[PDB]
């Protein structure tokens, strides 16, 4: 309302209206799934922090690998480190979108390596994840059940 | 605490600054368009030089107060930091005088080995390098039986599918890719 059309430039708008969404997460107090799961969250931050650590490093060290390795192509699409970024974290969780793809034959060494690393280092977290969720939703399970035999009394 | 909250510090600088240098940023007006590392050159042989020095001055402090001046060479940080410092010394002594495309990136890739001296920081790499240790028994039997598999399906696949119009698997050596990527 206070900024409507009139004073508004196309680079200045939708990074508020993108927030719009934002009212879906409303929806916590109806289920209490979503709110489990922000309490499993917050429960695990001690893990989240080391996988992102993990995944940036790793990142880091195979884009450099793969950036060396396969810098001196014909159109060679990874120009930058910054470039094999989003190639890295496309083979490390086993997307494989196809775009770019190493032709070499060190690059095809380390991108295998890379798949498997990334395998490896984001099944890190996922035990632990869901055993805290289920976890925590057996305890208010018996939690629930609990008052209720109190209310038979 | 402060030595440590700051050799953590130059570490990453040396990461950051590793990363970036391949950027190509600056239009240049006047030629083609560079890569920041080089265009600003004396810019980045600075910091490169002075985040080695650091590492050095650390290294020596480390290594004299060891009650095996010997065992801390074996250690699994010791070549950490000397393979972090040394493809900066070949570096000088190999300066772009004598030099060829061939023979450098093979020492300049070893520079992102540095990113490893984050271990005693993290209790998570550590813990992590010695499960891995702990496990050693179980990665033999998984690269065993993937080179195999990798060589059963490789056989299979390139009989099967050789004979067609463009064929792309020319070779066994030519169905590793894809049956890895598989």
């Given at each position: 309302?206070?900024?409507?059309?009139?004073?508004?430039?196309?680079?200045?708008?939708?990074?508020?209206?993108?927030?719009?969404?934002?009212?879906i997460f409303?929806?916590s107090?109806?289920?209490?799934?979503?709110?489990?799961?922000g309490y499993?969250?917050?429960?695990?931050?001690?893990?989240?922090?080391?996988?992102?650590?993990?995944?940036?490093?790793?990142?880091?060290?195979?884009?450099?690998?793969?950036?060396?390795?396969?810098?001196?192509?014909?159109?060679?699409?990874?120009?930058?480190?910054?470039?094999?970024?989003?190639?890295?974290?496309?083979?490390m969780?086993?997307?494989?979108?196809?775009?770019?793809?190493?032709?070499?034959?060190?690059?095809?060494?380390?991108?295998?390596?890379?798949?498997?690393?990334?395998?490896?280092?984001?099944?890190?977290?996922?035990?632990?994840?869901?055993?805290?969720?289920?976890?925590?939703?057996?305890?208010?399970?018996?939690?629930?059940?609990?008052?209720?035999?109190?209310?038979?009394? | 605490?402060?030595?440590?909250?700051?050799?953590?510090?130059?570490?990453?600088?040396?990461?950051?600054?590793?990363?970036?240098?391949?950027?190509?940023?600056?239009t240049?007006?006047?030629s083609?368009?560079?890569?920041?590392?080089?265009?600003?050159?004396?810019?980045?042989?600075?910091?490169?030089t002075?985040?080695?020095m650091?590492?050095?001055?650390?290294?020596?402090?480390?290594?004299?107060?060891?009650?095996?001046?010997?065992?801390?060479?074996?250690?699994?940080m010791?070549?950490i930091?000397?393979?972090?410092?040394?493809?900066?010394?070949?570096?000088?002594?190999?300066?772009?005088?004598?030099?060829?495309?061939?023979?450098?990136?093979?020492?300049?890739?070893?520079?992102?080995?540095?990113?490893?001296?984050?271990?005693?920081?993290?209790?998570?790499?550590?813990?992590?390098?010695?499960?891995?240790?702990?496990?050693?028994?179980?990665?033999?039997?998984?690269?065993?039986?993937?080179?195999?598999?990798?060589?059963?399906?490789?056989?299979?696949?390139?009989?099967?599918e050789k004979?067609?119009?463009?064929?792309?698997?020319?070779?066994?050596?030519?169905?590793?890719?894809?049956?890895?990527?598989?």
């Amino acid at each position: 309302l206070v900024m409507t059309n009139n004073e508004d430039v196309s680079g200045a708008f939708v990074t508020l209206r993108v927030f719009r969404v934002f009212r879906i997460f409303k929806f916590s107090r109806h289920s209490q799934g979503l709110r489990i799961l922000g309490y499993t969250l917050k429960s695990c931050a001690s893990e989240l922090g080391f996988l992102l650590f993990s995944l940036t490093m790793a990142i880091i060290i195979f884009a450099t690998v793969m950036f060396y390795a396969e810098k001196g192509s014909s159109a060679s699409k990874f120009t930058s480190i910054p470039a094999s970024f989003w190639y890295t974290i496309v083979t490390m969780t086993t997307l494989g979108y196809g775009d770019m793809v190493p032709k070499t034959i060190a690059g095809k060494i380390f991108g295998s390596i890379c798949s498997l690393s990334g395998v490896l280092v984001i099944a890190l977290p996922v035990p632990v994840i869901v055993s805290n969720f289920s976890r925590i939703y057996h305890q208010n399970q018996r939690a629930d059940k609990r008052r209720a035999q109190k209310k038979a009394r | 605490l402060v030595f440590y909250y700051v050799t953590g510090f130059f570490i990453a600088v040396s990461v950051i600054t590793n990363v970036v240098e391949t950027v190509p940023c600056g239009t240049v007006p006047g030629s083609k368009e560079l890569p920041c590392g080089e265009r600003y050159s004396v810019a980045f042989f600075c910091l490169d030089t002075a985040c080695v020095m650091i590492f050095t001055v650390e290294y020596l402090l480390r290594l004299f107060a060891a009650p095996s001046r010997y065992r801390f060479i074996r250690s699994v940080m010791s070549i950490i930091d000397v393979v972090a410092i040394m493809p900066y010394y070949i570096g000088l002594v190999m300066t772009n005088n004598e030099d060829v495309s061939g023979a450098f990136v093979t020492l300049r890739v070893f520079r992102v080995f540095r990113i490893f001296k984050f271990s005693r920081h993290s209790q998570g790499l550590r813990i992590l390098g010695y499960t891995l240790k702990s496990c050693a028994s179980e990665l033999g039997f998984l690269l065993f039986s993937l080179t195999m598999a990798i060589i059963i399906f490789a056989t299979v696949m390139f009989y099967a599918e050789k004979g067609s119009s463009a064929s792309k698997f020319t070779s066994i050596p030519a169905s590793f890719w894809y049956t890895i990527v598989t």
